[PDB]
Amino acid sequence: TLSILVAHDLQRVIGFENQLPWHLPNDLKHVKKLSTGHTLVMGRKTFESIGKPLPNRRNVVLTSDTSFNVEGVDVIHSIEDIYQLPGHVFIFGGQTLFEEMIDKVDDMYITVIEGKFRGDTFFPPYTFEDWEVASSVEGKLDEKNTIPHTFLHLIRK
Numbered sequence: 001t002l003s004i005l006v007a008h009d010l011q012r013v014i015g016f017e018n019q020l021p022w023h024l025p026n027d028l029k030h031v032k033k034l035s036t037g038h039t040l041v042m043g044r045k046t047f048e049s050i051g052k053p054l055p056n057r058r059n060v061v062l063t064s065d066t067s068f069n070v071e072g073v074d075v076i077h078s079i080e081d082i083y084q085l086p087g088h089v090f091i092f093g094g095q096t097l098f099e100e101m102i103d104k105v106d107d108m109y110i111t112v113i114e115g116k117f118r119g120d121t122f123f124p125p126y127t128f129e130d131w132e133v134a135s136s137v138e139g140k141l142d143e144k145n146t147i148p149h150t151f152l153h154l155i156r157k
C-alpha cells in the first residue's frame with residue numbers, strides 16, 4: 001500500500017516554523033502504531049525539523065542533496081524512487097511532498113485537529129467526493145491531550 005499519514009487542523013494547517021503547532025501525544029502514539037515495522041517517506045525539511053530517524057521502521061528522506069547522509073536514514077532523489085520501495089509506505093510530510101503525492105496514494109490516515117492554529121504550511125485541499133470514510137474515531141480528551149481530534153482513514157473511491 002501507499003498511504004499518506006498527516007495531522008491537520010480545521011484549515012488544513014500542518015506546521016508553523018518547522019514545528020507542529022500542537023502537542024498531542026495520542027496522535028504520536030497513533031503514528032507509532034501505524035508505522036512501526038514499515039516505511040516513512042518524508043521531505044528533507046520535515047526530517048531536519050526532527051533531526052533523528054524514528055526507531056523501528058525504515059526512514060526514507062527525499063532530497064536533491066547528493067551529499068545528504070545520516071545514519072539510519074535511506075535517501076532518495078526522485079518521486080519515482082518512492083514506487084520502488086517495498087512494503088507499506090507512508091508519505092509522512094511535508095507540504096511539498098503531500099502536494100506531490102495526494103493524487104497518487106491509495107489511502108490517507110488523517111488526524112483532524114478540531115482547532116484553528118496559526119500556520120505556514122498546509123495539507124492540500126481534498127473533497128470527500130473522492131474519498132470513502134473507512135473509519136472515523138474520536139480521540140480521547142484528557143490532561144495531556146486537550147485538543148479535540150478525530151482519526152480518519154480515507155480510501156480513494
Ligand SMILES: NC(=O)C1=CN([C@@H]2O[C@H](COP(=O)(O)OP(=O)(O)OC[C@H]3O[C@@H](n4cnc5c(N)ncnc54)[C@H](OP(=O)(O)O)[C@@H]3O)[C@@H](O)[C@H]2O)C=CC1
Nearest residue numbers: 006007014015019043044045046063064093094095096097
Ligand atoms: N502536521 C503534520 O502531520 C506534519 C507536519 N509537517 C510539517 O511540514 C513542514 C515542512 O514542509 P515543507 O516546507 O513543504 O517541506 P518538506 O518536508 O516537504 O521538504 C521539502 C524538501 O523536500 C525535498 N523534495 C521534495 N520534493 C522533491 C523532489 N521531487 N525531488 C527531490 N527533492 C524533493 C526538497 O529537498 P532539498 O531542498 O534538500 O532538495 C525540498 O526542499 C514542517 O513545518 C513540518 O512541521 C510535516 C509532516 C507532517
Ligand SMILES: COc1cc(-c2ccccc2)cc([C@@H](C)C#Cc2c(C)nc(N)nc2N)c1
Nearest residue numbers: 005006007028031046050052053054092093111
Ligand atoms: C523522523 O521524522 C519525524 C518523526 C516524527 C515523530 C517523532 C516521534 C513520534 C512520532 C512522530 C514526526 C515527524 C513530523 C514531521 C510528523 C508527522 C505526523 C504526525 C506528528 N502525526 C500524524 N498523524 N501524521 C504525521 N505525518 C517527523
